[PDB]
Predict the structure of Tropomyosin alpha-1 chain.
Amino acid sequence: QLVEEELDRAQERLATALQKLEEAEKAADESERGMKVIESRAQKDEEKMEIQEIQLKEAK
Amino acid sequence: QLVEEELDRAQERLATALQKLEEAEKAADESERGMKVIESRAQKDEEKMEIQEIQLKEAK
């Protein structure tokens, strides 16, 4: 009766939470992806910077 | 009793849903923190290496 109506309410909250968790998982994973690619860029540009400044020293 | 067991088990399940959502969004937050700090790092490193390559070419 009303108890099964409560069941339906609980399960619809459940489904809403499932959609939410799917969105959150996608967001977190893509965020980690961006994180790793930017870390790679930072390391490589730091290496380029150091070699450039050493060459500048030699040139001076 | 089938309705009541569905009710209470789905209640524990929505509790699990909320807690896994919370940990997922916390992982999202820490990922965003890593992202923003490495964005700052990439920015400063790139601007520095640009200035340095400019200074090297001018010195040459």
The helical segments of chain A are 2-59. DSSP finds one helix and no strands in chain A. Chain A touches chain B at residues 3-4, 6-7, 10-11, 13-14, 17-18, 20-21, 24-25, 27-28, 31-32, 34-35, 38-39, 41-42, 45-46, 48-49, 52-53, 55-56, 59-60 (CB under 8 Å).
